[PDB]
Design a protein around this ligand. Structure first.
Ligand SMILES: *C(=N)[C@H](C[C@@H]1CCNC1=O)NC(=O)[C@@H]1[C@@H]2[C@H](CN1C(=O)[C@@H](NC(=O)C(F)(F)F)C(C)(C)C)C2(C)C
Ligand SMILES: *C(=N)[C@H](C[C@@H]1CCNC1=O)NC(=O)[C@@H]1[C@@H]2[C@H](CN1C(=O)[C@@H](NC(=O)C(F)(F)F)C(C)(C)C)C2(C)C
Lengths: 298, 297
C-alpha cells in the first residue's frame, strides 16, 4: 500500500553526466558515444541580455571548452548547433554508453530528472509535463544540462535537457534534438506561461490510487457522463478525457466506474472539506495511470 | 515548489539481486561474498507465526536462486543476523562500494531503492517517524528493498524492508538485523504508537513555503521557544532546542523561527480550506538540511 512520486533508478544515466565549462559559464552535458550534448548558451559571452547565437558560434574557440568527468578531461573535436543545444564531438567514446534512444515527452506524461550541479549528479525525482510544456523541477543555478529520461523495455530514452526558469517559477527545457518544449526561447528575455490546464487522466488515476489504498471518504454513488465532464473541463482548465476505457484496469480492480470519479473531480475541485486525499489538500495531476498501476500492482 | 528527492542510486543498484527460495521471491543486498535479505523468504507459511531457527535448520541451500542480469549466485552457508538472512555466496560482488552501516533516527530522511523481485524499480525519499515507521509505497515482492543515505562522501546502508502494519505504515530493519521500532517479522497484528511530529522538519517545511512565495499563513506574531516547547509536549510535537539550525534559512527568507513556531500552533488547528505546498496539513518529512539543499544547492 501507499503512493509516492517516484523516479526510476538513475544509475544508468550517472556515468553520462559531465561538467561543461566555457568562458564565463559552467553547466552539465550529456556524454553519449563520442558526443557531449549541452545547452548552447554555455558559449554565450553575455547572458544578461539577448544573445546572437550565430555570432557566438562563428567565434567559438574549441580550446576554451573544459569538459571533465572525474579525473578525465574530454577534448572537443568540433561544435555545431542542433536546435537550442550544442553538439560537441569529443576525442573519447564514453565506455559506459547505454543502449538508448531519444524521444519527446507530451503534456500529462511523466518522466525522471537527474538534477546535476555543474557536472555532479545531485538528485533524482519524477516530474510531469504541464500543458504549456513546462515542469516544476527544483532547478537552480548550475543545473542547466540536467537530463530527463525514461526507462522502458531495457532501453534508456533521453527526453529532456534543462535550459531556463520562467518568472513564475516554472521550468523549461528541450528534447535532445534541440526543440524547446512549449516553444520557448533560450534568450534571457522575460517570457510568459499561459494558463495551466490540469491533466484529467492523471487526476482520475490519483483518485483511483486513493481508493485502492483504502481511502474512500470522497466517493459517492453519484455519477457524471463523460460528455458533461468534458464540457466542465474545457471551462475549468482541465483536459478532456477521450475514453472511459483508458482506465479499464483501474476500474476492474477497484469496482468503481470512471463516471463516478468524474463526479468527484468537479465536487472536490470546489474544496476537500478540510480533509485530505493521500496527504494532498487539492487534486493532483502528477500521477499517470501507468504510474499508479506500477506502484500498487507491480 | 518543494518535492521529496532521492540521492543518486547508481552506487547501490549493482548490489541488488533477486532472492528466491521455493515459491518465495524478494530482494537481497549483495555485498562482498554475502547476500543479505529478510529471513522470511525461507518461511514455509508466512500466514502463521514462524519458528525461524527451526526453519533454518531444515533449509536446503541448493533450493535458493539468486540472480541479477548476467550474474547467478550459489549459496555456501546461511545464518541469521537478527531478522536478516546472511547468505555466503560463491562469488564476490565486484562492484561493492565502500560503505558503513548505521541506523536512522526519528525525523531523519533517507533514500529508498524500491525493488520488485530483484529488479530495482524506483527510488524516492522517506522520513523516519517517531514509532520507527516510515510512509512509503511497498507491495508484494518488495521486501529486501534497501534504504541508504550518502553523508559526507560516505555511503550508509540504513534500512531493509520487511512488512506493513495494518494502518499502512512500513517497517524494516537496519542492516544489522535490528527491527526499527522493535516490531516482529511475524504475521501478527501489531499497533503503532502515537506519531510525534518533528518540529524541526515542520519549521523547514514552512520556510520552504515562504521561499516558494506562499506566505498567506504568516504574521508578525511570534512565540518564544520556551512557550512553544511547553505547547509541543502536549500536542505530539518535538521540542525545539535552538534556532541555529535555521539561522541560514532565516537569513535568506528574513523570517524568524519564533514567527514560524506561532504558525505551527495556529496551523495545527487547521488550514481553513487552504493549502501549503499542495498539502492540506503540516508536513514533517523535510529536514532543515533537505530544504537548504533544494533551495540553495
Ligand atoms: C542554467 N544553469 C540556468 C538554470 C536557471 C537558474 C535559476 N533557475 C534555473 O532553472 N539557466 C539560466 O540561467 C537561463 C539562461 C540565461 C538566463 N536563464 C534563466 O533561466 C533566467 N530566466 C529567463 O531568462 C526567463 F525568465 F526568460 F525565463 C533566470 C532569470 C536566471 C531564471 C539563459 C540563456 C536563458
Ligand atoms: C515483503 N515482500 C512483504 C511486503 C508487504 C506486502 C504488502 N505491503 C508490504 O509492505 N512483507 C510481508 O509480506 C510481511 C512478511 C509476512 C507478512 N507480512 C506483512 O507485511 C503482513 N503484515 C502483518 O502481518 C502485520 F500487519 F501484522 F504486520 C501483511 C498483512 C501482508 C501486510 C511477514 C514475515 C511479517
Amino acid at each position: 500500500s501507499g503512493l509516492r512520486k517516484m523516479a526510476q533508478p538513475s544509475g544508468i544515466v550517472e556515468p553520462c553526466i559531465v561538467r561543461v565549462a566555457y568562458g564565463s559559464n559552467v553547466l552539465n552535458g550529456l556524454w553519449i558515444g563520442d558526443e557531449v550534448i549541452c545547452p548552447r548558451h554555455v558559449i554565450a559571452s553575455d547572458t544578461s541580455r539577448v544573445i546572437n547565437y550565430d555570432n557566438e558560434l562563428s567565434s567559438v574557440r574549441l580550446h576554451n571548452f573544459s569538459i571533465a568527468k572525474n579525473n578525465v578531461f574530454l577534448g572537443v573535436v568540433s561544435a555545431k548547433y542542433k536546435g537550442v543545444n550544442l553538439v560537441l564531438k569529443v576525442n573519447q567514446v564514453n565506455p559506459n554508453t547505454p543502449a538508448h534512444k531519444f524521444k519527446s515527452v507530451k503534456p500529462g506524461e511523466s518522466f525522471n530528472i537527474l538534477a546535476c550541479y555543474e557536472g555532479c549528479p545531485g538528485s533524482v525525482y519524477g516530474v510531469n509535463m504541464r500543458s504549456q510544456g513546462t515542469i516544476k523541477g527544483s532547478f537552480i543555478a548550475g543545473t542547466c544540462g540536467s537530463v530527463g529520461y525514461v526507462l522502458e523495455n531495457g532501453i534508456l530514452y533521453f527526453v529532456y535537457m534543462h535550459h531556463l526558469e520562467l518568472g513564475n517559477g516554472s521550468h523549461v527545457g528541450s528534447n535532445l534534438e534541440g526543440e524547446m518544449y512549449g516553444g520557448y526561447e533560450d534568450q534571457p528575455s522575460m517570457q510568459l506561461e499561459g494558463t495551466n490546464v490540469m491533466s484529467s487522466d492523471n487526476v482520475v488515476a490519483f483518485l483511483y490510487a486513493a481508493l485502492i489504498n483504502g481511502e474512500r471518504w470522497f466517493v459517492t454513488n453519484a455519477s457524471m457522463s463523460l460528455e458533461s465532464y468534458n464540457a466542465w473541463a474545457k471551462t475549468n482548465s482541465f483536459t478532456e478525457i477521450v475514453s472511459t476505457d483508458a482506465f479499464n484496469m483501474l476500474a476492474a480492480k477497484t469496482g468503481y466506474s470512471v463516471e463516478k470519479l468524474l463526479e468527484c473531480i468537479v465536487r472536490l475541485n470546489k474544496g476537500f472539506g478540510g480533509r485530505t486525499i493521500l496527504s494532498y489538500g487539492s487534486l493532483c495531476d502528477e500521477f499517470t495511470p501507468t504510474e499508479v498501476i506500477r506502484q500498487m500492482y507491480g
